[PDB]
Every structure is written in structure tokens, then in C-alpha cells.
DNA sequence: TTT
């Protein structure tokens, strides 16, 4: 089945409130009322937070509360606090005997002023064109939140394939960053006219284009 | 109650994956057990799981590669996935399913599928207000490598990025420096790839 | 076989 969809970032101050959203389809999170929530910090197992769309295990500070609209399901945490800082998990049943998890949204607790990511577009180095091989470069630097969606397109065209993109990770400035590479074979790159990153971060999206030359 | 995932953490392309999880201060006789995984920096994914009476039920993109299996003599449940590309390179997790939620999880096991031997890297240029410049470090194996720019001394504007795992089972990352693009082409910027696992330096001058 |  498909994964429940989820927005890829969500952010507030501490004190402020904010709702993640988890969009299934009529036969799991619009099928039952068996949706949980799970919160995972760097490095640790993901933590039940929510099950049966609304209820909170022992221990869950009543600030976390579950909900659930058509085929949305929400969880809200009001009053943040600096430790809700963590990826986020939505879980529904899906029917016999299965199981599907969300796509997971950062909620990040905001301790500076939103970045703009600054993009570079890298095209395959000769050097890398002699070796038989292509690889474009897509460095994303300088972003809070550390959050971030690349898609890459060919002629305008998007391009699933051959695409891997790095978590976001902490630069010694304390801003966020991250990579993404495509793979191509040699002609691959040539027989294209152009090919593009497209940065979308906090609503706004960068986008930076190269071609063979 | 506890529940804790054994087994190794690297595993062969095309070979079978064996994970198994160890119940403490509980028992396996009720309720179900279960197998999650999250390939690294990306979500969550079910991959089945096992009711203390036998009955097993997957994942249904996995489904003819996935065995789990019941140990009741030692408190046990395992994983077996079969077919095994570096796709499946992920953390595993076990976990118990009660009432409609997966309540205790393990700390979960790293595996990384790769039938890679030792290789040292390829370095390859990412070639340049303010300006970015780079190297990727390509299709080595295994973890790690270290980056450092003008022989450490050049620190300001540097980052080292993650390692991705390709479809190949070799590593490949990038570092990047970000300079004043009114130095370029007067100060040198090299960047210094350390692979100790297969006894390589490298040293690429970018320009 | 199966909350």
C-alpha cells in the first residue's frame, strides 16, 4: 500500500501550538479508528504517543491530543516545549492484518530566525564523465528549519530514479544542511537538453539548473 | 518488559537477513510481535508481524521474502528477509502490538546489505560574493572516511555530509566548502580524503 | 488460526 501523507515539516515557538496532518485513504485511517502516533528523537526507538486516534498512553503529557477528519488524521501539540523537538509517525490499520506508517514530519521547537537554503547545482565532473559515470550534485546549505524536499527534473520533466537525498544535518554554524545526488549514465546526461534541482523549504521553493557544455 | 533485536549487522546482496528479538520480564503467549524497519535518514516501515498462536501476516510488498517465526522456548520471535539488495539497508526494529498500537520497541540494529570488499575511494571535483566548492568521495567500503580541508586548516564554511549507500553496496559522500569567490583561482583549496579501512589518503586540489 |  501507500505510505500516509504527511507534511515533511512543521514549526512553532516554544509555547505555540501546532497540528501535523496524516492523509490515508478510505480503507486505513478513514477505514478505523485504530490510528497511533509515534515520536522518535535522534538515535532512539519511536515512542507511542497516540493510539485509537485520540487516546494517551500512561506517562504522554496531556499537551499531545489526536484527532481524526475523513481520511486525515491530526495530531496537535500545544504549549511546546523545547524536548518535542523529534520526527513524528503516523500509524493506521489497513486492512487484513497490515499496517501502514506516515511519512514522518519534523517538528522543530524554533531557537532562531527561519534561513532561506542557499542551492548549488553541481554538474558531473569531466573527470567523473571519463570514469564512465555522471553524478549531479545538489548541495542545500545554510536552512532552519533543518527541513527540507528536493525533487529533480529533466527538461522539466520530474525524475524518480536514480535519486538519493541526505537527512538534514547540523552545520558547525548551527544553521542546517543537506545533499542530494542523481545518477545518470554519461549519455543519460547528454541526451538531455537541462536538469534541475528544486529546493522547497518553509513554503518557498529554489530551484537551479545545468546542461552538458 | 523489554523486548531487544540480536543478530549481525552486515549482511550479503542476494543472501538472507536474520534478525531475532529477546522478551524479557514477559512472555511471548499473548498479543503480537512485531517488525518494523527505517533505511537511514527516511521513515518508518511495517514489515509484519506474528500472533503468539503462529498466525503470520506481512507486509504485502515484502510478502514473499518475509518469514517470521515464534521461539517459545526461549522467549523469542525472529526475521528472516530474504533476497536481500541495498535497498533493504535499514535499521530493524522489533516491537510488541497490543490493542492496536506497538507499545515496546527495541533499540533496533543497524544492517547494512552489502557484499562489498574493502575499497578505497574515488575523489572527484565539484568545481566553483561567496562561492561553493567540493569533493565527492565515491564508492568506497566500508565506513568511514574523513574529510579535512588545506590539511585541517581550513575549517570556516566546511561541511562533511552523510554517507549514502548506492545500489552498487559502496558508499559515496560529498564535503563542501563555501569561500569568497574573489580568492578562487590564488588560494588552493584541497581537500584531504583519510580511508583508513582499505590504507588509502587521498589529497584533490579543486579549481 | 490471528486484537
Known amino acids: 500500500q501507500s505510505a500516509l501523507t504527511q507534511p515533511r515539516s512543521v514549526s512553532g515557538s516554544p509555547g505555540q501550538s501546532v497540528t501535523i496532518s496524516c492523509t490515508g485513504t478510505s480503507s486505513d485511517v478513514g477505514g478505523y479508528n485504530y490510528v497511533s502516533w509515534y515520536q522518535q528523537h535522534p538515535g532512539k526507538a519511536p515512542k507511542v504517543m497516540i493510539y485509537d486516534v485520540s487516546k494517551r498512553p500512561s506517562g504522554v503529557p496531556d499537551r499531545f491530543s489526536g484527532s481524526k477528519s475523513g481520511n486525515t488524521a491530526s495530531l496537535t501539540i500545544s504549549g511546546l516545549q523545547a524536548e518535542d523537538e523529534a520526527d513524528y509517525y503516523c500509524?493506521?490499520?489497513?486492512?487484513?492484518?497490515?499496517?501502514?506508517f506516515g511519512t514522518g514530519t519534523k517538528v522543530t521547537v524554533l531557537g532562531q530566525p527561519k534561513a532561506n537554503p542557499t542551492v548549488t547545482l553541481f554538474p558531473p565532473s569531466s573527470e567523473e564523465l571519463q570514469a564512465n559515470k555522471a553524478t549531479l550534485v545538489c548541495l542545500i546549505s545554510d536552512f532552519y528549519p533543518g527541513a527540507v524536499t528536493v525533487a529533480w527534473k529533466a527538461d522539466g520533466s520530474p525524475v524518480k530514479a536514480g535519486v538519493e537525498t541526505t537527512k538534514p544535518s547540523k552545520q558547525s554554524n548551527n544553521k542546517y544542511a543537506a545533499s542530494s545526488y542523481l545518477s545518470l549514465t554519461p549519455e543519460q546526461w547528454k541526451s538531455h537538453r537541462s536538469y534541475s534541482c528544486q529546493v522547497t523549504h518553509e513554503g518557498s521553493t529554489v530551484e537551479k539548473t545545468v546542461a552538458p557544455t | 518488559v523489554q523486548l531487544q533485536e540480536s543478530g549481525p549487522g552486515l549482511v550479503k546482496s542476494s543472501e538472507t537477513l536474520s534478525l531475532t528479538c529477546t522478551v524479557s520480564?514477559?512472555?511471548?503467549?499473548?498479543?503480537?510481535w512485531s517488525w518494523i524497519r527505517q533505511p537511514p535518514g527516511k521513515g518508518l516501515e511495517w514489515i509484519g508481524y506474528?500472533?503468539?498462536?503462529?498466525?503470520?501476516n506481512y507486509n504485502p510488498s515484502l510478502k514473499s521474502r518475509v518469514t517470521i517465526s515464534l521461539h517459545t522456548s526461549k522467549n523469542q520471535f525472529s526475521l528472516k528477509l530474504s533476497s536481500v539488495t541495498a535497498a533493504d539497508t535499514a535499521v530493524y526494529y522489533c516491537?510488541?502490538?497490543?490493542?492496536?498500537?506497538?507499545?515496546?520497541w527495541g533499540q533496533g540494529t543497524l544492517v547494512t546489505v552489502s557484499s562489498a570488499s574493502t575499497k578505497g575511494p574515488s575523489v572527484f571535483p565539484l568545481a566553483p560574493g561567496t562561492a561553493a566548492l567540493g569533493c565527492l568521495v565515491k564508492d568506497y567500503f566500508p565506513e568511514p572516511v574523513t574529510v579535512s580541508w588545506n590539511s585541517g586548516a581550513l575549517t570556516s564554511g566546511v561541511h562533511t555530509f552523510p554517507a549514502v549507500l548506492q545500489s552498487s553496496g559502496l558508499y559515496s559522500l560529498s564535503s563542501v566548502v563555501t569561500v569568497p569567490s574573489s580568492s578562487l583561482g590564488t588560494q588552493t583549496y584541497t581537500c584531504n580524503v583519510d580511508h583508513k579501512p582499505s590504507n588509502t589518503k587521498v589529497d584533490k586540489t579543486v579549481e
Open positions: 516491537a510488541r502490538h497490543r490493542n492496536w498500537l506497538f507499545d515496546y
Open positions: 500509524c493506521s490499520y489497513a486492512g487484513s492484518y497490515t499496517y501502514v
Open positions: 520480564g514477559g512472555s511471548i503467549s499473548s498479543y503480537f
Open positions: 506474528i500472533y503468539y498462536s503462529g498466525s503470520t
